[PDB]
Design a protein around this nucleic acid. Structure first.
Ligand SMILES: [Zn+2]
Lengths: 59, 207, 145, 176, 38
RNA sequence: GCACCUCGAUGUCGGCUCGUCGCAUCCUGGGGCUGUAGUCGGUCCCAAGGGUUGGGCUGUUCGCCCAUUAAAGCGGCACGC
RNA sequence: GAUAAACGCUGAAAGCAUCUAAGUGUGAAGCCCACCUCAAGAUGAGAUUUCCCAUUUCUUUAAGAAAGUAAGACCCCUGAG
């Protein structure tokens, strides 16, 4: 699931750890399984979480 | 360049014109049909297919006849090539007579050796015997297989396997006669080949 | 046993990519190229199935060798016969067989399974600047890597 | 870079063409072209030439001196031309001319003939003295070196080809 | 030549010359002073 | 030197057959210096491509000796087998 | 053809000197060619020349099964280069 999060996160211009740090600054607690299969299937949901993680560490 | 195939007949002696005995092989030929011309645009070569004998027409196939039919001849046994010749001078269906080696006299001769079956490890490689007396038991054997430490056998420790049957050139021989009416080249020396076998005869390389 | 995707053999479409090599060193070209062929940069892994892509290489070559190593990285081949080490190449392979550079320094980068063979035959390395493969409509990558 | 701060004055009849790396010097004899590095700013201003450059590199100062000396090679070679002169001691050594070949009989059992490229002449007044003229320094030096290498001198009697002024220091040999 | 691991100027007119990763000492005075770390 | 290793058994030296590897090189090859006139030489740098003998004396290694040759190398491989 | 030791040409950093950093050569029985042989099971399985042209049932047309054939090959027999 880390490797799949790697590829799908790198698709949206985020390296594979700044998601982790941003989503914990956005205080979000998704398991790595759930981000893996949402990253495969729901492009809209994964880009929504990607934009809130862009917004989180933007401070 | 100058290339002619042919048979192999035997061994004779010929006095030269100062009265000297010389051993001489007897090599035939016939008229000699060029079958194809291979160029760079088609094969990336420059080469010429040649062929020497007359089969009966029972003893061939339709594709052999489809090769032969562009030169209007009989279907033949042996078919070889020749590389590195400045072409011109060659059409599909010419004949290369025996006349090309008048006194060229610097010629490589190739054949195939005889065949001698399974033989011992002496008669190939010239490895010597062991002592035939003083109580030993080691008359005609191929040695020791190597050291101990590598736990294997290194490659090329040569042993008993069939003698002869591969093709061998001999470089820089002379030519004595050319008998145009009988299609015979006479050569000093010795040629690897059993009787009736093929021989290729070319102009030599090393000038 | 529950729900994660295990992709099949004929589910993932493949693509065709074109990569230049004008004055980039060997290691980083080979690294990006070898990470392409396993199926990374695609969120649909298996460790079973060739989810990778096809990679064409132009201008083999004009690859750098940084600092020295023009005359120094000696390759070695041994021929399973006694004394048969042949160190015949050097950085000479830039001049002749510049196919043979990248086909070694990428084959090292891959696993040595059977997938490290089916994922190797998708390379095509050309020292010149021509596609014979224009029938398949390949795209272009940009390396800032 | 005291050598990299020359006063260079172009001689009468010499222009400049600047196209990237090439700088051409054309005049009464030659039309030589070389190439020069891109840490170099060329200049303006008929006949006085200087070379101010984007300086403070690491080794700071090699490019000024070598360039550059090379521009003075260009100027003196195109305008004037060069010479290197040789000799022949070691009694019985000859130098004879048939155009662009030099028959040297240096005491072997065979003569030696040296050829020439385009922009190199030869002048042989006597049976001893060969004077090589030309346009470059490199080419003149290489041809003179090739001529000396047939027989460089020896420290007993001083045979072989020399300069005009070598210090061939001399040992002693006993008579036995 | 003299090939010695330590290299010293023998005479007055010696000069210390680097030509590779390599240390040379060359006189025009005597030919006996061509030295090299080696 | 020590005693880890092999006591329900791990057989020594030389010679014969067969080799292979290293170079701190015996000859042949390229060089620098000389207290190198010449032919000879001394020392040092590069270089492993090939070659490196038959006999007398004890079981010999080792060695002494005769007659040759461009030379009659030193070592590892269970002091190779 | 590119090198090893060795020798240069030009030239500065260092108004000189200097084979080197830029540039540019000579240079060995050694390296890669040149000579002889094996070689597409080189699963990256290469290239050229010449020869050969169609029944049935449906499993439904899928690279289906089954049977007669072509070009050609094999079995069996007399043998040796
Ligand atoms: Zn001194």
């Amino acid at each position: 699931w880390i490797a799949r999060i790697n590829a799908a996160a790198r698709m949206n211009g985020l390296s594979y750890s700044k998601l982790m740090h941003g989503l914990k600054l956005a205080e979000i607690d998704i398991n790595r399984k759930m981000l893996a299969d949402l990253a495969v299937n729901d492009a809209a949901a994964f880009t929504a979480l990607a934009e809130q993680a862009k917004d989180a560490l933007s401070k | 360049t100058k290339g002619i195939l042919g048979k192999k007949v035997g061994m004779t002696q010929i006095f030269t014109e100062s009265g000297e005995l010389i051993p001489v092989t007897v090599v035939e030929a016939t008229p000699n049909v060029v079958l194809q011309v291979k160029t760079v645009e088609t094969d990336g070569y420059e080469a010429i297919q040649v062929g020497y004998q007359d089969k009966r027409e029972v003893l061939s196939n339709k594709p052999a006849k489809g090769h032969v039919a562009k030169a209007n001849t009989a279907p033949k046994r042996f078919i070889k090539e020749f590389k590195n010749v400045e072409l011109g001078e060659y059409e599909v269906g010419k004949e290369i007579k025996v006349d090309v080696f008048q006194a060229g006299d610097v010629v490589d001769v190739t054949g195939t050796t005889k065949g001698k079956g399974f033989q011992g490890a002496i008669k190939r490689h010239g490895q010597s015997r062991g002592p035939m007396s003083h109580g030993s038991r080691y008359h005609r054997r191929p040695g020791s297989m190597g050291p101990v430490a590598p736990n294997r056998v290194f490659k090329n420790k040569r042993l008993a396997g069939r003698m002869g049957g591969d093709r061998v050139t001999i470089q820089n021989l002379e030519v004595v006669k050319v008998d145009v009416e009988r299609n015979v080249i006479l050569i000093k020396g010795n040629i690897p080949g059993a009787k009736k076998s093929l021989i290729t005869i070319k102009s030599a390389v090393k000038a | 046993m529950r729900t994660t995707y295990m992709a099949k053999a004929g589910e993932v479409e493949r693509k065709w990519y074109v990569v230049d090599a004008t004055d980039v060193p060997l290691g980083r070209l080979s690294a990006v190229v070898a990470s392409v062929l396993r199926g990374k940069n695609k969120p649909t892994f298996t460790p079973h199935v060739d989810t990778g892509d096809f990679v064409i290489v132009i201008n083999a070559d004009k690859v750098k060798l940084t600092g020295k190593k023009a005359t120094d990285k000696i390759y070695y081949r041994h021929s399973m016969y006694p004394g048969g080490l042949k160190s015949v190449t050097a950085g000479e392979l830039r001049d002749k067989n510049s196919r043979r550079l990248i086909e070694t320094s990428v084959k090292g980068m891959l696993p040595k399974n059977t997938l490290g063979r089916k994922q190797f035959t998708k390379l095509n390395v050309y020292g010149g600047a021509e596609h014979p493969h224009a029938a398949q409509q390949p795209e272009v990558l940009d390396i800032t890597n | 870079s005291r050598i990299g701060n020359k006063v260079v004055v172009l001689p009468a009849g010499v222009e400049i063409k600047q196209d990237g790396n090439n700088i051409t010097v054309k005049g009464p004899k030659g039309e030589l072209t070389r190439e020069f590095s891109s840490d170099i700013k060329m200049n303006i201003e008929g006949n006085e030439v200087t070379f101010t450059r984007p300086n403070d590199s690491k080794e700071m100062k090699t490019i000024h001196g070598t360039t550059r000396a090379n521009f003075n090679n260009m100027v003196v070679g195109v305008s004037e031309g060069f010479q290197k002169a040789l000799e022949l001691i070691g009694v019985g050594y000859r130098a004879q001319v048939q155009g662009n070949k030099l028959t040297l009989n240096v005491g072997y059992s065979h003569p030696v003939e040296m050829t020439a490229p385009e922009g190199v002449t030869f002048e042989v007044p006597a049976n001893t003295q060969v004077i090589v003229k030309g346009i470059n320094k490199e080419v003149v030096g290489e041809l003179a070196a090739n001529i000396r290498g047939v027989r460089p001198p020896e420290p007993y009697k001083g045979k072989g080809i020399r300069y005009v002024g070598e210090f061939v220091r001399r040992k002693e040999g006993k008579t036995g | 030549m003299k090939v010695r691991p330590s290299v010293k100027p023998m005479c007055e007119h010696c000069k210390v010359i680097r030509r590779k990763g390599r240390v040379m000492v060359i006189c025009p005075a005597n030919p006996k002073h061509k030295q090299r770390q080696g």
